[PDB]
Design a binder for this molecule. Structure first.
Ligand SMILES: CCCCCCCCCCCCCC(=O)OC[C@H](COP(=O)(O)OCC[N+](C)(C)C)OC(=O)CCCCCCCCCCCCC
Ligand SMILES: CCCCCCCCCCCCCC(=O)OC[C@H](COP(=O)(O)OCC[N+](C)(C)C)OC(=O)CCCCCCCCCCCCC
Ligand SMILES: CCCCCCCCCCCCCC(=O)OC[C@H](COP(=O)(O)OCC[N+](C)(C)C)OC(=O)CCCCCCCCCCCCC
Ligand SMILES: CCCCCCCCCCCCCC(=O)OC[C@H](COP(=O)(O)OCC[N+](C)(C)C)OC(=O)CCCCCCCCCCCCC
Ligand SMILES: CCCCCCCCCCCCCC(=O)OC[C@H](COP(=O)(O)OCC[N+](C)(C)C)OC(=O)CCCCCCCCCCCCC
Ligand SMILES: CCCCCCCCCCCCCC(=O)OC[C@H](COP(=O)(O)OCC[N+](C)(C)C)OC(=O)CCCCCCCCCCCCC
Ligand SMILES: CCCCCCCCCCCCCC(=O)OC[C@H](COP(=O)(O)OCC[N+](C)(C)C)OC(=O)CCCCCCCCCCCCC
Ligand SMILES: CCCCCCCCCCCCCC(=O)OC[C@H](COP(=O)(O)OCC[N+](C)(C)C)OC(=O)CCCCCCCCCCCCC
Ligand SMILES: CCCCCCCCCCCCCC(=O)OC[C@H](COP(=O)(O)OCC[N+](C)(C)C)OC(=O)CCCCCCCCCCCCC
Ligand SMILES: CCCCCCCCCCCCCC(=O)OC[C@H](COP(=O)(O)OCC[N+](C)(C)C)OC(=O)CCCCCCCCCCCCC
Ligand SMILES: C[C@H](CCC(=O)NCCC[N+](C)(C)CCCS(=O)(=O)[O-])[C@H]1CC[C@H]2[C@@H]3[C@H](O)C[C@@H]4C[C@H](O)CC[C@]4(C)[C@H]3C[C@H](O)[C@]12C
Ligand SMILES: C[C@H](CCC(=O)NCCC[N+](C)(C)CCCS(=O)(=O)[O-])[C@H]1CC[C@H]2[C@@H]3[C@H](O)C[C@@H]4C[C@H](O)CC[C@]4(C)[C@H]3C[C@H](O)[C@]12C
Ligand SMILES: C[C@H](CCC(=O)NCCC[N+](C)(C)CCCS(=O)(=O)[O-])[C@H]1CC[C@H]2[C@@H]3[C@H](O)C[C@@H]4C[C@H](O)CC[C@]4(C)[C@H]3C[C@H](O)[C@]12C
Ligand SMILES: C[C@H](CCC(=O)NCCC[N+](C)(C)CCCS(=O)(=O)[O-])[C@H]1CC[C@H]2[C@@H]3[C@H](O)C[C@@H]4C[C@H](O)CC[C@]4(C)[C@H]3C[C@H](O)[C@]12C
Lengths: 238, 238, 238, 238
């Protein structure tokens, strides 16, 4: 335990955290420069080793963090993420992974408390949304099957495959070129195609708008519940 | 009644409901595989009979459910839907109906209580919206007549018909290519066409945004009404 | 006054109002049929006189309504609208006005109380919005001048004129093809054009979103003010 | 101080402020006329000197305002803006600045209290949003690096440069032609490009919607906090 505590004061120190963040920022700046072919020609050698050095340091950090937090490390989503991102960066270049290495810049989120809280807040609406997500996904899936069967033969790029219909349906949901780009061309062969896509647009839009309304109103309901109980206690206690 | 109760314990049992859901899911998976021409070549025979078997089972289920619920079955929207969807699936292939058969996967909504509640919640805003829907539809109808008269002769695809103008107006509402795709071309012949479509976009957008604002605020009003009465009773009772 | 009251019981009767609405609906149906060249060939003669008859009746109605309400008629926006729309319909065909005649179908709004209330509610947010509308319009006006000067020479269709720049800026606000259709082409000649349109998109979007947030929140503030005073009175009276 | 007060009664007078606003409006009208080549041919000489006269007056005003407010002038954002805009207008034409001169029409905002308040209100949400803006910007930056590396070689116009990828990513966020214009073309070479842009669209949309929800709900929380304390005091005092 003497050893354990020695490294624990380091890993827990303000300086340790600041250093890592410093590195994350430097490496973030570096990753953008590596975008310039000009810059690389001149200083690519400098940068590649700095990336190996940062990742070496980040690996020492994850290791030390694990000896400190023990099992609590892998029950922590933020630490898992730092693990998974640093580990990606450790797979040798010998291709998609080379690009995923830049995800280690999200470590600037996992290391900065203000950013953690933002992401925690945003994520917290999701668990209550899961069933609505399930229902929407079932909706897409049913309509994707139908679209593939109705239109996949004459419009294979957009509907010849369940995957392609899923993609197209998502495009229609975003309303991106849904009429000039998809439904009008479809209607030149299938004049009733509008009977398929208009209702689909109504549902997907109605559901999303009403999901937002429910989140706002149902939160106010809770807010009103919390303060209603506090007031009644003062009425009751006084 | 002995007979009646025997089948009522079945139809009402946890196992009965789970089985049906199992089938709905299996059949849902099956319907997606039937999308692959490759898969069909190999196993289409297997799948077609499984669809006949599932639908046979689903028909036995609807029948049994009707002997159990009697008149209460047809006063239930969820049961009507299961009826109407299973009945569609019973029309012989000898074409649009073949595709509508996939609607029986929405039965995964009518059989799962969590999903029912979602749809019930979303639907519940609609009755209060009917008049606004009526007003919007009257608005579309008037403008569709006008557009057909103003532009249908020189732009028949987009406005030559009341139906076509309805479709185009819906496209403009979604803002999909309204300017580059419709109004700018229109303005090459009718330079004041913007006087028609800009105001139309303002109204349709203003109305929809303000419908959402009213739903949120008017709900809070009710929320505040409910808790205002509860507090006053504690002030009054205490 | 004997005479005056005789016609006042008519104009105020349930039957009188229902009749007019009946006519508005019939005439509305008629206006849609007149869209079909086929229908007109066969029954155009029938319909044109029915339109003259309805408008004759509507003119008798406005007249009678004025003898009844006297000065109160022209201080009523709904009645003014019925006046202005029926008067349009009275200008002889000997062209844009022929199309504006269909506005008399909005009379179905001015005659149906449910519809009046909808429009009243929606309109009621506007007076508080006037200054924000003014600020947005000033914003457009300034940017339209700038765009005309920056881009009107090389892109006259989109920016050669203050009016054209106003139109284009509105298109960009709706986000319709703003990048592929306008800014990317602009950037082939003016590579910094993004410095103009991106900020413009940020402001217009930020302002509109925040106008909606303010309306919702400021209404809740009032709702909370009203119920806060009611509760305090019960605390104070009890 | 005698001198100081003499000019202070002027600069602070209702008449002084009204005059400036009068000029701002006249000059605003003038700036729009200067857009017409026809108008300029006839009256350009008139207008150019009127612009020199207005700016001369506006310079006298800023000067006088500074002798009056002393150090308080440069600690005032509204006054800084009037300074910075009038100063721009003072750089001799001997080009982008000639266009920036029209920014002096925003002085109609800095001089009209109603407009000041609007802008103050809208701006006031921003300080609390800074971290979310930072997180979104980090998000863009990471994805821009990735896009440049994944697609910049085969699609240089859209992704060959970190700047170009930033621009394209912003376009995708606005959903402008994201599928037909960018991702579908990308997918003809990179069939998994959807794995990159769909999630990107989900995050950016989820974050913005949820930022709006949080602003509305967190404001209500405060509203409820303020009135909860007022009620409890009446319960407690009474
Ligand atoms: C809770 C809601 C359910 C969520 C549904 C999730 C959506 C699943 C999408 C799977 C996409 C499959 C790959 C793809 O898109 O390409 C199509 C392939 C290629 O066809 P090919 O064989 O090349 O001709 O052809 C195929 O592979 C089509 C076969 C796909 C069957 C997948 C079944 C998923 C089970 C969904 C549960 C349904 C419950 C009712
Ligand atoms: C309003 C509440 C939330 C609403 C969101 C739910 C709606 C579902 C949206 C689905 C997203 C669109 C899926 C998509 O783009 O492609 C589906 C894939 C692609 O198959 P594939 O054919 O391989 O690729 C497209 C064709 N190709 C190769 C030429 C490009 O093939 C597939 O079938 C894959 C199946 C993916 C669907 C499951 C995704 C749901 C997760 C989203 C929940 C996130 C919560 C925040
Ligand atoms: C909840 C679900 C709501 C969404 C329901 C989906 C209905 C979509 C219907 C539109 C389908 C469509 O436009 O095209 C498919 C069929 C067949 O095209 P069709 O024009 O008949 O044949 C063309 C022949 N060809 C290839 C040689 C040129 O086109 C037709 O045959 C037109 C038939 C229209 C039937 C629409 C009936 C609405 C079903 C809703 C049932 C209640 C749920
Ligand atoms: C409460 C708001 C009212 C809601 C309005 C509902 C909208 C009705 C749309 C009906 C669409 C008719 C079929 C269509 O779109 O194609 C146009 C056809 C073909 O012309 P064609 O004869 O082939 O030359 O030519 C026609 O069929 C045009 C004749 C259509 C007349 C339909 C009248 C609906 C009554 C609306 C009540 C008006 C109240 C003021
Ligand atoms: C903001 C509150 C809600 C706002 C929604 C209300 C606005 C109304 C939107 C109307 C939807 C657009 C209708 C449409 O796309 O086509 C109208 C049909 C088609 O006629 P048709 O000429 O046969 O087909 C188009 C031409 N063609 C054959 C070459 C394709 O011909 C017709 O005239 C049919 C008439 C359909 C209008 C009635 C639909 C209103 C129900 C929507 C309410 C849903 C509540 C959630
Ligand atoms: C409170 C915010 C102010 C609201 C501003 C309202 C916007 C006014 C738009 C007027 C549009 C004029 C007609 C048009 O668009 O075509 C451009 C014409 C044709 O140029 P042309 O002579 O054919 O060469 O060329 C022109 O006519 C350009 C001259 C237009 C001058 C209009 C001045 C409006 C006063 C705005 C107050 C400014 C306060 C700072
Ligand atoms: C977020 C809060 C609300 C935001 C809305 C305020 C933003 C202002 C939007 C302006 C609307 C776009 C105006 C427009 O499209 O054209 C402007 C006109 C047209 O001039 P013109 O050159 O004759 O026509 C275009 C060129 N041409 C002939 C080839 C087509 O030439 C003009 O300059 C006319 C000036 C019209 C601007 C005044 C309109 C403001 C009223 C909107 C307030 C409605 C409250 C609900
Ligand atoms: C609040 C207001 C916020 C909005 C401010 C508006 C700034 C817009 C600046 C973008 C202007 C632009 O891209 O084009 C105009 C100039 C001239 O083009 P330029 O590329 O220099 O000349 C092309 C020559 N030619 C025709 C023979 C090919 O292009 C340039 O010269 C580029 C110079 C960029 C200056 C941007 C400085 C930001 C001003 C913000 C001041 C604070 C307020
Ligand atoms: C808090 C979130 C961070 C906010 C990030 C702000 C975004 C910075 C964008 C800077 C854009 C640079 C100019 C540009 O876009 O053109 C690309 C140039 C031309 O390449 P070229 O040399 O002509 O080949 O090639 C380059 O110049 C690429 C090199 C740009 C490196 C900029 C590094 C910014 C530091 C961000 C902090 C990262 C923290 C993890
Ligand atoms: C939902 C919460 C708010 C979300 C907003 C935050 C998302 C960030 C949006 C970024 C805006 C898009 C930037 C952009 O359009 O270009 C980036 C510039 C341009 O580089 P450049 O290559 O020179 O020009 C484009 C290529 N060219 C020359 C052929 C046109 O090259 C750069 O890299 C410049 C870096 C600009 C990014 C920093 C801007 C963040 C400030 C926005 C916060 C405003 C608060 C209201
Ligand atoms: C009822 C709806 C729609 C699904 C449905 O079941 N109908 C879904 C959408 C997302 C859920 C919200 C978020 O989770 C955040 C938060 C969690 C708290 O726990 C309770 C309050 C709140 C505001 C939830 C209420 C909201 O309304 C839920 C139940
Ligand atoms: C007043 C407006 C616009 C129409 C109008 O009449 N103006 C319409 C739009 C939809 C309606 C809402 C939904 O129905 C859900 C719910 C039903 C409850 O019963 C009362 C509360 C609430 C939130 C309704 C209030 C909302 O405001 C209604 C009256
Ligand atoms: C403060 C903002 C933005 C302008 C500004 O001055 N900042 C503007 C936008 C439109 C206005 C709302 C609507 O008028 C409807 C209603 C009228 C009541 O009278 C007071 C409450 C309410 C909800 C108003 C509050 C809202 O906030 C106003 C003052
Ligand atoms: C919590 C979120 C998201 C960031 C995060 O930290 N999670 C951010 C987004 C913008 C912020 C709002 C605005 O600033 C206006 C206003 C300022 C007051 O001071 C407190 C209330 C209010 C409504 C703020 C609450 C809101 O929720 C903040 C904290």
């Amino acid at each position: 335990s003497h050893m354990y505590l020695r490294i624990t004061n380091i890993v827990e120190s303000s300086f340790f955290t600041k250093f890592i963040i410093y590195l994350i920022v430097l490496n973030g700046i570096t990753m953008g420069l590596e975008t310039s072919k000009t810059f690389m020609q001149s200083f690519g050698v400098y940068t590649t080793l700095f990336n190996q050095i940062v990742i070496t340091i980040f690996t020492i950090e994850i290791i030390l963090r694990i000896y400190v937090h023990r099992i609590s490390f892998f029950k922590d989503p933020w630490s898992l993420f730092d693990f998974f991102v640093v580990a990606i960066s450790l797979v040798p270049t010998s291709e998609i992974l080379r690009v995923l290495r830049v995800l280690r810049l999200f470590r600037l989120v996992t290391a900065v408390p203000q950013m953690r809280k933002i992401v925690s807040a945003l994520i917290s609406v999701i668990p209550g949304m899961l069933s609505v997500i399930a229902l929407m996904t079932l909706f897409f899936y049913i309509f994707a099957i139908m679209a593939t069967q109705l239109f996949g033969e004459r419009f294979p790029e957009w509907f010849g495959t369940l995957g392609e219909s899923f993609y197209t349906l998502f495009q229609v949901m975003t309303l991106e070129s849904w009429s000039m780009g998809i439904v009008r061309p479809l209607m030149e062969v299938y004049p009733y195609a509008w009977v398929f896509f208009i209702p689909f647009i109504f549902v997907v839009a109605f559901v999303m708008i009403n999901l937002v309304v429910a989140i706002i109103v149902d939160a106010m309901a809770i807010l009103n519940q919390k303060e209603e109980q506090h007031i009644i206690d003062e009425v009751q206690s006084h």
